[PDB]
Design an enzyme around this catalytic site. Structure first.
Site, PDB file in Angstrom:
ATOM      1  CD  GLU A  29       3.943  -0.687  13.046  1.00 21.03           C
ATOM      2  OE1 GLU A  29       4.675   0.280  12.795  1.00 21.03           O
ATOM      3  OE2 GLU A  29       2.726  -0.572  13.258  1.00 21.03           O
ATOM      4  CB  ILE A  48     -16.267  -4.707  -2.070  1.00 28.47           C
ATOM      5  CG1 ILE A  48     -17.592  -4.935  -2.802  1.00 28.47           C
ATOM      6  CG2 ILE A  48     -15.165  -4.164  -2.982  1.00 28.47           C
ATOM      7  CD1 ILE A  48     -17.547  -6.011  -3.848  1.00 28.47           C
ATOM      8  CE  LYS A  51      -5.495   1.433   2.329  1.00 35.88           C
ATOM      9  NZ  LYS A  51      -5.846   2.200   3.557  1.00 35.88           N
ATOM     10  CB  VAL A  67       5.158  -2.547   2.686  1.00 36.17           C
ATOM     11  CG1 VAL A  67       5.406  -1.042   2.707  1.00 36.17           C
ATOM     12  CG2 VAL A  67       6.434  -3.325   2.329  1.00 36.17           C
ATOM     13  CG  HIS A  71      -4.837  -3.777  11.681  1.00 37.63           C
ATOM     14  ND1 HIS A  71      -3.816  -2.873  11.476  1.00 37.63           N
ATOM     15  CD2 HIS A  71      -4.738  -4.165  12.970  1.00 37.63           C
ATOM     16  CE1 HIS A  71      -3.171  -2.675  12.607  1.00 37.63           C
ATOM     17  NE2 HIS A  71      -3.711  -3.449  13.529  1.00 37.63           N
ATOM     18  CD1 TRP A 101       3.993   5.903  12.287  1.00 39.77           C
ATOM     19  CD2 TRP A 101       2.681   7.713  12.102  1.00 39.77           C
ATOM     20  NE1 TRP A 101       3.220   5.752  11.137  1.00 39.77           N
ATOM     21  CE2 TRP A 101       2.409   6.848  11.010  1.00 39.77           C
ATOM     22  CE3 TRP A 101       1.984   8.926  12.199  1.00 39.77           C
ATOM     23  CZ2 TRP A 101       1.459   7.154  10.038  1.00 39.77           C
ATOM     24  CZ3 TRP A 101       1.045   9.229  11.226  1.00 39.77           C
ATOM     25  CH2 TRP A 101       0.802   8.345  10.156  1.00 39.77           C
ATOM     26  CE  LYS A 220      -0.783   4.985  13.781  1.00 37.80           C
ATOM     27  NZ  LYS A 220      -1.171   4.468  12.463  1.00 37.80           N
ATOM     28  CG  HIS A 224       6.936   1.984   4.856  1.00 38.73           C
ATOM     29  ND1 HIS A 224       6.455   1.323   5.964  1.00 38.73           N
ATOM     30  CD2 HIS A 224       8.064   1.330   4.490  1.00 38.73           C
ATOM     31  CE1 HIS A 224       7.244   0.313   6.247  1.00 38.73           C
ATOM     32  NE2 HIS A 224       8.244   0.304   5.382  1.00 38.73           N
TER      33      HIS A 224
HETATM   34  N1  AMP Z   1     -13.689  -3.507   2.529  1.00 39.90           N
HETATM   35  C1  AMP Z   1     -12.356  -3.253   2.658  1.00 39.90           C
HETATM   36  N2  AMP Z   1     -11.425  -3.813   1.846  1.00 39.90           N
HETATM   37  C2  AMP Z   1     -10.100  -3.555   1.969  1.00 39.90           C
HETATM   38  N3  AMP Z   1      -9.612  -2.713   2.898  1.00 39.90           N
HETATM   39  C3  AMP Z   1     -10.447  -2.089   3.757  1.00 39.90           C
HETATM   40  C4  AMP Z   1     -11.887  -2.330   3.698  1.00 39.90           C
HETATM   41  N4  AMP Z   1     -12.459  -1.588   4.674  1.00 39.90           N
HETATM   42  C5  AMP Z   1     -11.476  -0.933   5.315  1.00 39.90           C
HETATM   43  N5  AMP Z   1     -10.283  -1.232   4.749  1.00 39.90           N
HETATM   44  C6  AMP Z   1      -8.942  -0.813   5.133  1.00 39.90           C
HETATM   45  O1  AMP Z   1      -8.487  -1.792   6.044  1.00 39.90           O
HETATM   46  C7  AMP Z   1      -7.308  -1.233   6.632  1.00 39.90           C
HETATM   47  C8  AMP Z   1      -7.019  -1.849   8.006  1.00 39.90           C
HETATM   48  O2  AMP Z   1      -5.743  -1.420   8.465  1.00 39.90           O
HETATM   49  P1  AMP Z   1      -4.374  -1.858   7.707  1.00 39.90           P
HETATM   50  O3  AMP Z   1      -4.672  -3.164   7.009  1.00 39.90           O
HETATM   51  O4  AMP Z   1      -3.409  -1.965   8.868  1.00 39.90           O
HETATM   52  O5  AMP Z   1      -4.038  -0.705   6.804  1.00 39.90           O
HETATM   53  C9  AMP Z   1      -7.549   0.273   6.665  1.00 39.90           C
HETATM   54  O6  AMP Z   1      -6.442   0.934   6.041  1.00 39.90           O
HETATM   55  C10 AMP Z   1      -8.814   0.500   5.859  1.00 39.90           C
HETATM   56  O7  AMP Z   1      -8.684   1.549   4.899  1.00 39.90           O
END
Ligand code: AMP
Length: 241
Positions: A29, A48, A51, A67, A71, A101, A220, A224
């Site tokens: 996207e 840190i 995720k 997937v 961002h 969506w 959008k 998934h």
């Molecule tokens: N410190 C962090 N480490 C990893 N992921 C993060 C952090 N802060 C925010 N996020 C995530 O970064 C994501 C940015 O969008 P996306 O990578 O498209 O899902 C969001 O889903 C947030 O939950």
């Protein structure tokens, strides 16, 4: 735009991560500039990265489909980082589904019918519009008090998305992205929404095809539903450079 999804119980599972180089990850996207900036601000704030990316191996290529994590990927690249902790998915498992969506707004179809017509689109009144949209024969159906067919394919979907992402950030509409078409129609009946945009959801094979062509969907497009969310991880930003 504001996500508005059902309360799916998706389990957290303790699935280990592996570092993958960012230049081996392919987005599917277009990026939302607001989301990119927010991630950069968050990760630099705590230092840190908690995720992991969710990736799928591109068949026949030394590359991975992003997937989940557009961002994070793009933000890490803009910071000068080289890798990210990632979970590799069995993407073609029946356990993974892909939906879309449903962009729905509260407002008048006037500053929007004309402002899509300015980007170059058509909006034909058509009672079969939603039916045609769901078979993938038009770019979007636009449904509220009346029913409208928006002809075309991907280029036209990107124009419809473009208008809305700008107007949302500008603040002339309230833009919600519904996980489910029927939830938008409920909130429509209540008066909170006026119209919904309906396109056919992409298939997994289409997502992979688009990526192999070096193309991307508008924001959008994919939604998934995964068999698990990875548990949070303990990776320091400094490990990614
Ligand atoms: N410190 C962090 N480490 C990893 N992921 C993060 C952090 N802060 C925010 N996020 C995530 O970064 C994501 C940015 O969008 P996306 O990578 O498209 O899902 C969001 O889903 C947030 O939950």
């Amino acid at each position: 735009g504001v996500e508005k999804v059902p309360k799916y119980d998706i389990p957290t599972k303790k699935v280990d991560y592996v570092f993958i180089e960012l230049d081996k990850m392919k987005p599917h996207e277009q990026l939302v500039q607001k989301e990119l900036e927010a991630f950069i601000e968050s990760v630099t704030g705590s230092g840190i990265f908690w995720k992991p990316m969710l990736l799928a191996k591109v068949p026949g290529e030394d590359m991975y489909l992003i997937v989940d994590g557009h961002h994070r990927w793009a933000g890490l690249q803009k910071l000068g980082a080289k890798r990210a902790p990632s979970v590799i998915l069995d993407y073609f498992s029946d356990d993974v589904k892909v939906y879309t969506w449903y962009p729905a707004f509260k407002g008048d179809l006037n500053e929007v019918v004309e402002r899509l017509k300015k980007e170059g689109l058509e909006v034909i009144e058509d009672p079969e519009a939603e039916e045609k949209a769901e078979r993938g024969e038009i770019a979007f159906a636009l449904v509220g008090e009346k029913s409208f067919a928006i002809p075309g394919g991907l280029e036209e979907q990107k124009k419809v998305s473009k208008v809305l992402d700008e107007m949302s950030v500008e603040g002339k509409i309230e833009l919600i992205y519904y996980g489910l078409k029927e939830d938008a129609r409920e909130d429509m009946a209540k008066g909170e929404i006026d119209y919904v945009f309906i396109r056919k959801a992409p298939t997994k094979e289409e997502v992979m095809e688009l990526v192999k062509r070096g193309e991307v969907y508008s924001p959008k497009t994919t939604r998934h539903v995964l068999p698990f969310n990875p548990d949070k991880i303990d990776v320091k930003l400094e490990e990614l450079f």
